[PDB]
Amino acid sequence: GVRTSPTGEKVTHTGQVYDDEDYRRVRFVGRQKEVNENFAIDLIAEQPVSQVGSRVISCDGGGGALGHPRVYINLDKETKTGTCGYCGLQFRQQH
Amino acid sequence: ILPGAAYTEKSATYVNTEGRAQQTKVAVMPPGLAREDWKIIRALSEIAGMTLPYDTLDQVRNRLEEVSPNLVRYDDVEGANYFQQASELSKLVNQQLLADPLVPPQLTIKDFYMTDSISRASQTMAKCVKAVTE
Amino acid sequence: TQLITVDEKLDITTLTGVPEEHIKTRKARIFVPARNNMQSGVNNTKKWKMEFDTRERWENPLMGWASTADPLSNLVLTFSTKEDAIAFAEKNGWSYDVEERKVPKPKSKSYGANFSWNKRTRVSTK
Amino acid sequence: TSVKPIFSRDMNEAKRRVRELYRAWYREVPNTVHLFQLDISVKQGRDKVREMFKKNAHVTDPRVVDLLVIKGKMELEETINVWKQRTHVMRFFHETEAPRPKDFLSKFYVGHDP
Amino acid sequence: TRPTVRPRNDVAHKQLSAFGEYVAEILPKYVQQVQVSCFSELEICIHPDGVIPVLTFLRDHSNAQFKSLADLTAVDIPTRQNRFEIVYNLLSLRFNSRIRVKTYTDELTPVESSVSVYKAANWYEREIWDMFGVFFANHPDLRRILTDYGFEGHPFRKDFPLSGYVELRYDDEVKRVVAEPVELAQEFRKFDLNSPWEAFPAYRQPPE
Amino acid sequence: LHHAVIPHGKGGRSSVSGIVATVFGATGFLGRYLVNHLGRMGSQVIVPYRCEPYDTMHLRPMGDLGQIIFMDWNGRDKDSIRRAVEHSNVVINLVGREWETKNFDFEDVFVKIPQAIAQVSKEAGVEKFIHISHLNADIKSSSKYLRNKAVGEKEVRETFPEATIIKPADIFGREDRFLNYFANIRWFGGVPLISLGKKTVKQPVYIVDVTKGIINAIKDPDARGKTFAFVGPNRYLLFDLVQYVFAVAHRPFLPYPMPHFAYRWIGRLFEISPFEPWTTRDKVERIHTTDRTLPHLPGLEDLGVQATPLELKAIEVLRRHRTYRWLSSEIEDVQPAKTV
Amino acid sequence: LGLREIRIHLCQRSPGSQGVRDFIEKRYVELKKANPDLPILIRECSDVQPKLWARYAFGQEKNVSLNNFSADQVTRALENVLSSKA
């Protein structure tokens, strides 16, 4: 979801772009501002809310010892999904 | 506008309500071109042809000790005596009390957060005031 | 004899090679390092520290790093007594100031006073 | 306060060694200007040796000026023999630094330095 | 206490205690303390006027024979009044052991050079003039050995900071590598890693 | 005023100085020392380079990380000029050729390109433009160099009214074309001179003083629209100047007068080259043009710059051109020249 | 042109401030009743030498030491400060 600032320059996923009068655009004159166009928030908004049949769900990022340490998430609020702290996955109790 | 330093941006003697003199220490330097306050006033006296007899902060605190000698002795409350003479001086000016009741300017938690020139420019204090309204 | 009698001030400000720019224009601070309130331990309030006044830290225009020009910026020295720290500051000609030790006072902790008969210091919960 | 001396008992032998060291530098400076083929004259080098000796001219402790004679003789020992180079000799002559403003108003203008 | 604890050698502990008793009663003029560390290494703590009388004993006496000066070390400790602590490390091949002769000085008091005892110190204490500022009188060629030629100050002193007071750069005005006041690209980020819980109860010092 | 262009630091190499200077022609004589004296303050300097990139490599040790931005440009193209000056808060013009080539005459170097850079600097929001003319650049002068340079100066003054136009007389340095020129006529013969070289008066100025003047003109806002004139503190005749150069270089000096009409015929003998030519009649007409004195114009003393005389730095220039038999003769082992 | 402010510094416990202390409880009130527009700033510290400061017009100041003085000496010095106006 990369967008272009009104100075003609691409915006990072942090929110970094140089303004109109800032001289430090001159380091990109004739070269390119290398940014990543696969934003983390955009690629995790696509992931579905996992319906699980337990009150307390265990997340480890997948892979066992290849992901984040395994944390336990409470799922009592039906208003709010239970978002994992590390991986951005989120769960919901199905009843 | 002559932009000065904040309170975390200058070594600075402040005194509480009980007379205990304290000094701040420089956490970060002031942003942009803003200077320490008495540096601004000393340079303004150098421009205006009325050059003050100090350069650095030690000479400022020698001057400040000349004015009142508690402001450079930190973490030491100097107890003030002589209440009865101020009481005798107070009896001369017979002033009328008003019929208006004593109302403090800070009644509830909403009036607590935004008072001075730092707390009005804070978004955290804005969230606190907005959060204690409802 | 083989021993000389020197009654002068102990002055090695010309032998340490430190320039004048950072001998007379620095305010050394001798202080018991105050306890971090996140934790309860007092092992970092046992030995005195000499720090220096923080100088200018600016944005490196290429990378946003905190560039500096203070050579004595990252110097904190550990002393055991206040007399040795004051003698070290006066031996190097460093203009100093000393903040005294702020010990925690002895409290009067009683356990039955949480469950008193006629006092305001009862607990409403536990 | 009864300590061990290094070379001098009091300031008489200390001033003697300072004086002989400056004699050595005044004898040496034309050889330094010659073999390092510096663009300075002998007069400017001797002015710099005068400035380096008057920079430390406030010491009253005999051991401190004994060690200053020792460090000056080490500088002399590395100047007579070609162990220093043109850069090591010219580092005394601060040619490349911007001149540091001394008065208060310019120090107020250019930064936060007291 | 078996798998992950280093096994204790009481034999070298007892023998270094006995040899420390031996040296402390042979030399009561300069030997000030004698301590056997918990991993069986002896430290003979002497007086700075005893560099020549003690080390000539250990080099020559038929019960010591500390033939090789292995390492010579100053340890700058700023919280003392004799802030420098010259550490001699001696290796004895015949008795197959090591001893540690520690002594003290401040800046201005010289230490008598031990090149008349161990010629190996010809450079080592030379390094202590270059790094710390401990002057050694009656040394053959005493000068700097490691730092730059026009270098002012002594590096391993703890009042001397990590980065110095001069940096170098080539300057094409004067065609010369010149020394300028240091301006770092990034400030050295100091980390306050001292955890304020008391780590070792066997090393607690008594209070005021 | 933007926050990144506020000055910081002690004014060293890794300081921030708040100068964003596009130095056109920074690969030559004045540009080398100007990027040297800007990079020791911490200026985001744009170097537009025409030549081989390798010939600009010695501008890389002159600054911190990323303070020097090298970029291509062409003299007959306002696109790259606008591309280079649109982020600079000061533009400095150091474009010059002491001889004419096939692709560019004196006019395209001194009239077309400086007016092009000044017009594009006007229409891009630049605070300060600085042009470097010559002290003898006049419309009624004998050399096409000085005439084109005065025409281009008048154009820059009428197209950018706040341009600081600076007049150096005859700069000498280690890479000059003034003292090295005067020491490279032991090859051709006996350094021939027009009318014995006694009717022309010069005062050369040292490049560190001119560079300090240019940077103190950048810093001071009292330089908007002015016209400085950088001159040396001591005036010289040409004959004893050349004799002083050959006495510092310790060379056999036997001068002889070559006449006014036959020395341009030797001037055409060297400009038949597709290389950098050794000399030409334009260099002859510029050496034999005396330095005018302009009292109504400011100089180095009106920028807080103390001028360094010739007898301190001619040894620094001329230690290269000596043989081994007097390779290390001292500075005081030569007679000073006769000022007028 | 005239006096602007008086500053009187003294200790609490030192005997050198003692007569200065004997100036204040006995005679300061009718002093302040005599000088309504003139601020007379009493400043007590713990260890200072007793002093008497007088700021005049255009920033000039005068400085009188008060070490071990009694009440009449302090009183005469203060009325000289009042009557000087220099």
Ligand SMILES: NC(=O)C1=CN([C@@H]2O[C@H](COP(=O)(O)OP(=O)(O)OC[C@H]3O[C@@H](n4cnc5c(N)ncnc54)[C@H](OP(=O)(O)O)[C@@H]3O)[C@@H](O)[C@H]2O)C=CC1
């Ligand atoms: N003796 C002197 O040096 C004096 C000089 N001046 C003036 O100072 C200025 C600079 O002089 P100086 O440094 O000595 O000269 P240089 O020859 O050393 O440098 C001039 C620069 O201009 C560039 N340049 C010239 N013509 C063109 C062109 N057609 N297209 C693109 N770039 C071009 C060159 O680029 P490239 O590297 O690609 O060739 C070079 O970098 C000139 O205006 C000169 O008149 C004034 C007084 C004395």
Ligand SMILES: [Zn+2]
């Ligand atoms: Zn997870």
